[PDB]
Design a protein around this ligand. Sequence first.
Ligand SMILES: [Mg+2]
Ligand SMILES: [Mg+2]
Ligand SMILES: [Mg+2]
Ligand SMILES: [Mg+2]
Ligand SMILES: [Mg+2]
Ligand SMILES: [Mg+2]
Ligand SMILES: [Mg+2]
Ligand SMILES: [Mg+2]
Ligand SMILES: [Mg+2]
Ligand SMILES: [Mg+2]
Ligand SMILES: [Mg+2]
Ligand SMILES: [Mg+2]
Ligand SMILES: [Mg+2]
Ligand SMILES: [Mg+2]
Ligand SMILES: [Mg+2]
Ligand SMILES: [Mg+2]
Ligand SMILES: [Mg+2]
Ligand SMILES: [Mg+2]
Ligand SMILES: [Mg+2]
Ligand SMILES: [Mg+2]
Ligand SMILES: [Mg+2]
Lengths: 205, 155, 80, 129, 82, 14
Amino acid sequence: ARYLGPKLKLSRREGTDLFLKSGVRAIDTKCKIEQAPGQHGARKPRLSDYGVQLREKQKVRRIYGVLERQFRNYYKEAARLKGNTGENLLALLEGRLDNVVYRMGFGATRAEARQLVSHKAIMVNGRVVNIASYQVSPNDVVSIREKAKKQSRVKAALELAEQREKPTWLEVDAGKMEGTFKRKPERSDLSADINEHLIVELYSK
Amino acid sequence: ELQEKLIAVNRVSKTVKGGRIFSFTALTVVGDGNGRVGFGYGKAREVPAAIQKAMEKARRNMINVALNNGTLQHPVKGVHTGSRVFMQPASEGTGIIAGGAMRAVLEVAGVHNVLAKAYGSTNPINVVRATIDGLENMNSPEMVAAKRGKSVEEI
Amino acid sequence: KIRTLQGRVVSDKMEKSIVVAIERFVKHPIYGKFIKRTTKLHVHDENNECGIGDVVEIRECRPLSKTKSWTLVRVVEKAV
Amino acid sequence: SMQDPIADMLTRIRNGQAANKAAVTMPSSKLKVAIANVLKEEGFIEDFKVEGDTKPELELTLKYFQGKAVVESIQRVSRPGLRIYKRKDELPKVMAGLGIAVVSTSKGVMTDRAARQAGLGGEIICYVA
Amino acid sequence: MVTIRLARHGAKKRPFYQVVVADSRNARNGRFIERVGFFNPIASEKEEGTRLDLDRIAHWVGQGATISDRVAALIKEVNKAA
Amino acid sequence: ATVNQLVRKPRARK
RNA sequence: UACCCGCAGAAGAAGCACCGGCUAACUCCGUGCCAGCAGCCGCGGUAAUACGGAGGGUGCAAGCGUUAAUCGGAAUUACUGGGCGUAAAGCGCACGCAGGCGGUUUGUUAAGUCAGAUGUGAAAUCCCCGGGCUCAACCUGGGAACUGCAUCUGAUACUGG
RNA sequence: UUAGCUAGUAGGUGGGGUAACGGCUCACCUAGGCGACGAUCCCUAGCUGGUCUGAGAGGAUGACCAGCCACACUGGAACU
Ligand SMILES: [Mg+2]
Ligand SMILES: [Mg+2]
Ligand SMILES: [Mg+2]
Ligand SMILES: [Mg+2]
Ligand SMILES: [Mg+2]
Ligand SMILES: [Mg+2]
Ligand SMILES: [Mg+2]
Ligand SMILES: [Mg+2]
Ligand SMILES: [Mg+2]
Ligand SMILES: [Mg+2]
Ligand SMILES: [Mg+2]
Ligand SMILES: [Mg+2]
Ligand SMILES: [Mg+2]
Ligand SMILES: [Mg+2]
Ligand SMILES: [Mg+2]
Ligand SMILES: [Mg+2]
Ligand SMILES: [Mg+2]
Ligand SMILES: [Mg+2]
Ligand SMILES: [Mg+2]
Ligand SMILES: [Mg+2]
Ligand SMILES: [Mg+2]
């Protein structure tokens, strides 16, 4: 229920930084970022009206690692919830348990942060939840369990996200190896260039 | 500043003594995203020559329409040759749901939240003509208050 | 106070009984047009005072025969 | 023939509004006064007068903007072939609340905006769009 | 006859019981008369999971409704905790 | 077209 | 039994369909209207991204395709919401019962309709806010909904008597 | 491309009958009853709370759950 291909090959197909690696090595020093994977990557492809809804959907799903059966169920919840659909779409994507660990910086990559949730290391209010698709309620506190504090995947990741900027709604504590999910994020607090309205129209037909 | 979009390309022909001579028909729309849409039409021998002449008509033939924060005032009927156009404004955050013909008109005006459905013929050149004329007879709460004459809650 | 119907008499040939037709206006479940629906009931007529076309007032009683379940109260208008 | 005189009333209004006529006349009745007086109080027309007692003749003064139709379109809703009735919460709006819907109830002829404070329902007459 | 018994709802390996009034000729999930309350045997017993109403109970017991021994245990402990 | 026509016979579904 | 402790090492654990357009992704070779392909359009007699194969990619995922069936798209039986001069359609015409409908003014009835209230519309399902099973599916609390029907008190503008 | 159907049939008296009203049954008396708002005949089908589809109105259907009716090799009958 995952994707086992090359990571930056998905970025060679899309042409957008997706935070698939840490950030130590540059994005352009590993692959030609505006070359499609295959025989005619240097040839410019045509982009139709059906494409701009599909290419926007593939951009977001390759970040969170959510397959089509689960992402349609997220659309089943965001349509039922009141208010804006795209704002309720971001509430399900950011409220994922593997994203909260990643945005605090306990995992250097989203692939590493998913394994830290899965292989019994995350406490949620003193309780271990070993699935990465948990919807995180507000005003909760997460922490690292006592046996996983000595692992070097936590020691190596607390400095890379410290170099980058941190989100506003999270409270990262690196000495105690814990965190706090305070409130619900907004549209402007996240990536502004991601247009959530392109994805809803594909599921609106 | 102008936001343009191609709609459809259809190769047509003309029959002469020597045989058949082809040409191209291009339908384009432009806009500013703030309630000003101007559509044009092009006829030329070559496809980039065809779309450019449609863009040259697009600077003029451009109208004004009263938006309400990016959506319509009220649902309004549209009628044409075979394009029964029925539009309706929606709540905030619904997104543009329409065919490929109507999406070119609604994006260049800045319109976000509309219900849309076209009945009858599916010719994209007939759909957009009722779409433009369906907005110019669509009226504003201010201009019907210039008709009625009262500065009360209806404004 | 009690349940009471009103209608007119279309048949009076049989003894101790009359046939009273009831009309009602029905909104159609698909179109909405108000349509006259005829309900033909059999009413016990004591002493056989009802003629043809008499607007009459009837009420509910026990079943007295195979087809009868209604009885008489009084005649509103007779033999006009 | 003249079996729906309200539809005959709406026919004479819609024609003279489009054909730039300054004033129209029609045969009067009690119900036609109870509709035109509402349209006078809602800015759609200007004035109405009665003429004749054995042949009641109603008159309407038209209304324009710069020679443009104030009443753009009007739609007869209920009709003698099919009666339409709604409740106090199923009253339809015209152009999402811009136009008015003439509804006659037991408290006289009023609009759906005026029927909110009245809390009644009844027969829809016309959609004054 | 008029009796007070249980109706096993909930999924497999998750028992849950409805407190209803029914006839002896009906099944466990058969034709009841009215809903009275509920019971959760897999309740955490730190919170909600058992609530009835003694007013509707005394309306039918005074009319002669029989009581099963499992439901009567809830009757014997609704007065101890409340 | 007339509603009163469809009282006698509704629209024939194929 | 769920659950939990402990051990070992990435070790035990990814495939299918498509790639002319619709509809996401392009080249090469073989074949020669033959073989085949195909839901539609229609591809292939000497340069076929459409046949066969290879390379590479795309879409899904422990499932993926195909076939059959229902609705939607279909406003293509059009109440909402279609037409009948020539695209299918106004009987060859007329009388007329039943049926539908009906000018204007007043009074009356309160039938239709509208307002309010009572009783009822089993539970479950769906919807709203919650709770619980590590999560979800699922289970469940209460509310809403069930646009229904019956009765009573009202209003009288419209329809009916 | 089903227009007339029906003599215990429609009603009344009296007797009998069941736990209860009643052509439920019997003798007698009356000739009515039903029906173009679909009687009667033929074919098909368990129904409903619902499910699914659909913006809605509608449309298709009745498996699992629940309610009711019918049935227990075919047909008929009564006892308890
Ligand atoms: Mg032109
Ligand atoms: Mg068509
Ligand atoms: Mg099992
Ligand atoms: Mg493509
Ligand atoms: Mg093949
Ligand atoms: Mg070749
Ligand atoms: Mg799975
Ligand atoms: Mg088929
Ligand atoms: Mg249809
Ligand atoms: Mg047509
Ligand atoms: Mg013809
Ligand atoms: Mg003729
Ligand atoms: Mg009086
Ligand atoms: Mg229920
Ligand atoms: Mg309930
Ligand atoms: Mg529930
Ligand atoms: Mg939860
Ligand atoms: Mg009258
Ligand atoms: Mg007898
Ligand atoms: Mg079973
Ligand atoms: Mg059953």
